[PDB]
């Protein structure tokens, strides 16, 4: 009977895996009926920890998607999967080296059983963005239908455009966030983040992802806002970033260094299933 | 002879682990697969005689290069791939039959010597994570080594 779990990180449900010390071939068939909620487990996303491929890591991991197709989202299932090894014994290291389908990464498991990414350093060029302006600016006027709009832009690696709001509940974000997200200044369309700035170290955050519409927990648009925040002088080094679907904590030093990324993975269960 | 009924050849694993819990890894001489050291027991020895034998004959180390931390309790055994049976050879082995012992290295990296023996088994080894040569061993071996890599996890787990 294969073991496994059920973990939830970034509001998403992740079965989880361990295919380093079972002997599992994850076929396109197995994983669709292990998808089925009656039929096998039940998942969002089925989140496998391997072997490594490299020397110098210690593990790899895989996501697959309920239609069976390998899902390359980068830190996707990064946190499922830092608590997941620690907690079934396959490491006891808190700096753990990985592998997975969008390159390497290393992973810090906190002393909150927190984990910490390393997401890179915010580029503010909009020619990086990509984002239509002459030159970085920490605000940025736009007009948005007959309404004009004021905002920061960044790239994580992907484009996002943050507005200041003074309450997410009561913010516009499905007639302003269509609007801005394929807005003609952003020819790749952008991200469009609703931050409502509680405190220097605290703010609440929508966010109307590219093409996808409002999720409940959009990691690198947590960062985006809080580096545009920085950036603009309205945030501290270190911030809550409270989500619809939980708690994220930023910590960016400014310009020269990396942004990092800090969120929780609850173990929701253990269980097995004969295959 | 020392195989078996069942065409078993005794045998003996060393998983060798540095203080960084790596592990070493060790590459079949004039040929470009690696492995963990193993090697036959031999008439009249035990288990842990065959197993400081073939260390030092394979990997250069002295009792007291190194601490015994573990061993698996009964024989984990392996199937040859049947392509490389040798029928004609009396009497027939088909696999072999393996103890393994988790090593940990007390002396520097400098005391293994892969040519003590007249004919070596290696010509080069690293230190590799741990669980890497879950996936790099040969096929064959793969279902011995999980399981070996399993038992052994908890005790390198804990030398931080
Ligand atoms: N491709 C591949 N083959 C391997 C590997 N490891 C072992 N083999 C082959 O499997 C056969 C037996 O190997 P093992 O079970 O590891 O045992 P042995 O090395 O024979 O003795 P030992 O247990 O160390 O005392 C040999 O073929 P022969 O019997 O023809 O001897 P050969 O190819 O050497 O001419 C090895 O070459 C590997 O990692 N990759
Ligand atoms: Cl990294
Ligand atoms: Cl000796
Ligand atoms: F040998
Ligand atoms: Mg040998
Ligand atoms: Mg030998
Ligand atoms: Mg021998
Ligand atoms: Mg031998």
């Known amino acids: 009977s294969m073991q496994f779990s059920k973990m939830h990180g970034l509001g998403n449900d992740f079965m989880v895996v361990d295919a380093v010390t079972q002997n599992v071939f994850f076929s396109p068939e197995l994983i669709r009926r292990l998808a089925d909620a009656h039929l096998g487990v ?9 072997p490594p491929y490299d020397p110098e890591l210690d593990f790899h991991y895989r996501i697959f998607n309920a239609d069976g197709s390998e899902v ?21 290291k808190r700096d753990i080296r990985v592998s997975t389908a969008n390159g390497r990464m290393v992973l810090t498991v906190t002393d909150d ?11 503010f060029e909009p020619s990086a963005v990509p984002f239509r302006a002459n030159k970085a600016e920490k605000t940025y006027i736009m007009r948005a239908a007959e309404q004009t709009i004021l905002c920061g832009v960044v790239s994580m690696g992907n484009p996002h455009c943050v507005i200041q709001v003074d309450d997410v509940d009561t913010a516009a974000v499905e007639t302003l966030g269509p609007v801005l997200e394929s807005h003609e200044r952003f020819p790749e369309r952008a991200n469009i983040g609703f931050m409502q700035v509680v405190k220097r170290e605290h703010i609440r955050l929508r966010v109307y992802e590219r093409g996808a519409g409002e999720t409940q927990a959009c990691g690198s648009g947590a960062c985006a806002a809080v580096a545009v925040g920085i950036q603009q002088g309205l945030l501290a080094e270190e911030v809550r970033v409270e989500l619809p679907g939980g708690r994220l904590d930023i910590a960016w030093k400014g310009p020269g260094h990396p942004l990092y990324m ?14 | 002879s020392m195989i078996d009924d069942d065409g078993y050849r005794p045998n003996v694993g060393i998983v060798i682990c540095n203080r960084q819990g790596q592990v070493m890894w060790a590459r079949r001489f004039g040929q470009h697969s690696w492995q ?5 027991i031999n008439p009249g020895e035990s288990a842990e005689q065959a197993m400081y ?7 250069g180390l002295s009792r007291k290069d190194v601490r015994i931390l573990a061993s698996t309790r009964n024989w984990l055994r392996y199937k040859l791939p049947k392509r490389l049976v040798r029928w004609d050879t009396k009497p027939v082995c088909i696999g072999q039959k393996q103890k393994w012992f988790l090593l940990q290295l007390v002396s520097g990296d400098a005391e293994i010597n892969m040519q003590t023996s007249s004919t070596p088994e290696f010509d ?3 230190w590799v994570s741990y669980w890497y040569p879950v996936r790099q061993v040969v ?3 793969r279902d011995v080594y999980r399981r070996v890599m399993k038992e052994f996890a908890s005790v390198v787990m804990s030398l931080a």
């Open chain 2, 139 to 141: 096929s064959f071996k």
């Open chain 1, 113 to 123: 059983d927190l984990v910490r990414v390393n997401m890179g350093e915010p580029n």
């Open chain 2, 36 to 40: 963990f050291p193993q090697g036959g």
């Open chain 2, 124 to 126: 080069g080894w690293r």
């Open chain 1, 72 to 92: 390359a989202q980068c830190g996707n299932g990064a946190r499922c999967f830092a608590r997941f090894v620690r907690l079934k014994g396959l490491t006891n």
């Open chain 2, 53 to 59: 034998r073939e260390l030092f004959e394979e990997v």
């Open chain 1, 262 to 275: 800090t969120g929780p993975a609850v173990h929701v269960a253990d269980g097995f299933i004969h295959l």
């Open chain 1, 42 to 50: 039940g998942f969002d996303q089925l989140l496998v920890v391997e």
